[model samples]
Target: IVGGTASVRGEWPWQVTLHTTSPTQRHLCGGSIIGNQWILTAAHCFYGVESPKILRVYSGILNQSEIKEDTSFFGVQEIIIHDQYKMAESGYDIALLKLETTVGYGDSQRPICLPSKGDRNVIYTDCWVTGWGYRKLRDKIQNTLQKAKIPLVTNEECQKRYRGHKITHKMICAGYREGGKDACKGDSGGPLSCKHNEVWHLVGITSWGEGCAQRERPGVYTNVVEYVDWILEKTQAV
Candidate 1:
């Protein structure tokens, strides 16, 4: 969220920058590496079917500006979109990227764990979000990675925030009522990493929000646990 300063490299090792070069090199969205060959992100990232010679993913580099000066970028071999993702207005917002070449693991480059299918670890826990999104409305997207600790929010409580919007089982909410911290637009397809028994699980995928860091509304994310079956089906076979 907007409340963070510069973060150390590899602090969020699985954080990935989704980019294109139709006009110029710039970040299109954020994503997270879940395996050596599988990366997870919001399904909406492929909404427009835009052109790019390659689906560039910076798997190791933390600094956004360091891409040109780095070697962590990987080309996507293919993409798998959830078939029912677009059926509802805003549910099922997750996608996976199959890398052309397997990426190696290290402190700076590794995969984030996904919730085990039928896992009940999706509820409240200490978690945080990481990305290179904009800190403010008018400010440009940050170059250095940013992270903010956000606690889990209950669906009933989250329902009050979005009166008209439905809080489906496929979605989860997180943030503070004080409004000081929350995910931003550029954070879409990023991670809402939640900790359980000291293990970090990707509980959410940055999808939507009322406004950046508004005290009244927390950030909405695609419940990764809900789609765990779909993810395994699409990736494990490969």
Candidate 2:
């Protein structure tokens, strides 16, 4: 719902807009291109009864509803969810989507850089988020992709914020204490990126949050570091 525009260097091409089959015509979330044919998203995005034919992946679409006439619609061939993911725990909410065909990476569609083993924690300390979620609670989906700068909150601080909910090492939180800048519904599976050595590394994937933009409630994201091995193995085997 939060709609505003901001240009990100090495960011636009790697981002993707995901649309799912819904009777109400609702655009679900966003995703990141990690490989020529693989996109990283949240498992919940594909969970529940749904049709693969109704889902469409729009790469290089800055505005949610203003996609080009020639923008290709990619069918989701398969969805690979992390083996340990549990709905009850809300952990390991990560998944990889295989596109029917490889996307051409140039000005429109491109892949995001992956984080190294030792640099995960440091890279996330300062990161950015982009999406087309709601601008306000109960608001319509934003027309253009909105970007906001969010600093990674420490595990201790995150746990303190959501005392009852489990904030495990596999998840991280980001937002501002003052509010007005945060990822909301429809931003799920979008990239939470950080820059290292002048290269952008995807550190997290937007998963869940308490509200659109609220004080003391930051957006929760799936930690990309913990699932790097599984992601690499699955993509390699495919």
Candidate 3:
């Protein structure tokens, strides 16, 4: 989260940290609580690992290094990466995680609202992204959660920035053309939330970019609105 400030505790309650179950317990990517048992993230986060047995979720957290074992940790029961997500730049970069147990919602742990198919009036600018990503590409991941407000770049303009890329509607761009503010390394799979009618909606999922906060290269995210039906269908059956 380059050029971002430390986030207040529970400011983004739906934010969760995805980690590996190894001895080191490395924090891999960020995720959002979409349902009591469903976590939405980026498909690229699961690159080589598809087994649920190696993943764990840490919720209701502010500082990454201060988490206690008994607080809000849960094991993943299943992983569902989008079939069309071949790579980050190619788009369709979304995934869902089913938890081993239903998480209890509280001030520090709750689901982010999703927009319905017909709700196309949602605002594009004045949105916020939160994560524990690196301050710079070469720097280590931040222990404290960080957040920054960034405006969404129109797909037409973003397409102009990347001459060869498609900039499909399934993906959204958010950042300044001057750069210095973006979701960097380690922030992937995190939520890009926007407030509508006082409630926060999960508008995007941190996916990819040309580089960390580079000029004319805004961060790209998976458009949540484009897959609300797919999410509902997959989450409802189980």
Candidate 4:
């Protein structure tokens, strides 16, 4: 998360880290807990590494160093990438990861609510993106989760900034017009959570961007509201 501040424990309870199997347990992408066994993330995160046997999930932990000491890591039971998700540039960049075991919720681990079916496309404030993504180009990923408050931008505005690159309805854009904060590499699949009625809802999933915290190019996300039915269908099937 470029231009982001360190996030405290429990601030993003649903946030989780996706990693390659150890001894090369590298942070692959950020994820959100949607259910006891269901994890939400980006399809592109599995682009070349699609095997469930090679992926792992760590929850309820904020610092990366604590992962080895904690028993919160879980193995993947299944990887459900969207049928139409070919690449991040073409949207539909969402996926679900089923854990081998149900996660035990606590102050540091919880599921985030999905938007209601009747929810409108209203601009949301008090929205945040959190992850262990790099703070600057060429910098190593942070150990502690980083978070930044960014505002949602209309598709039209985002499209204007990213001319020639189509901004589809399934995509949501968030960042300042002058661009100082954004979800970057390793942050993909992380939740873009917005608060309403004292509850945080999964509004978007980090998908792509023109660059990290660059001018005019805000972070783009897979619109969770648009995929609510898809998620419900998949979760029900399993």
| Candidate 2 per-residue lDDT over residues 1-238, each given as its tens digit | 2434565434568888888756644577788999998999888777673556667788877766665545566777877878887662378888888998889889878899877778764744558888887777777667777788787888788888887898999998888776667787778888998877778888989988787668888788898888888888999885
The 10-residue segment of model 2 with minimum total lDDT is: 1-10
lDDT of 1 by residue, 147-172 (tens): 99887788898899889999887898
Q: What is the C-alpha RMSD of each candidate to the true structure, in Å?
A: 1.9, 2.3, 1.3, 1.3
Q: How much lDDT does candidate 2 score?
A: 0.78
Cα lDDT of model 4 by residue, 13-86, tens digit: 99999999745768999999999999999999997784799988999878988877355688999999899988
Cα displacement (angstroms), candidate 3, residue 59, comes to: 0.4
Better structure of 2 and 4 per lDDT: 4
Residues 79-106 of candidate 3: C-alpha lDDT, one tens digit per residue: 9988888999999899999999999999
- Candidate 3 Cα misplacement greater than 4 A, ranges: 68-72
| Residues forming the 10-long window of minimal summed lDDT in candidate 3 | 117-126
Compute the lDDT for candidate 4: 0.90
Candidate 4 TM-score, true structure as reference: 0.96
Q: What overall lDDT goes with each candidate model?
A: 0.82, 0.78, 0.91, 0.90
The candidate scoring highest on lDDT is: 3
- Each candidate structure's TM-score, on Cα atoms with residue i matched to residue i, is 0.93, 0.90, 0.96, 0.96
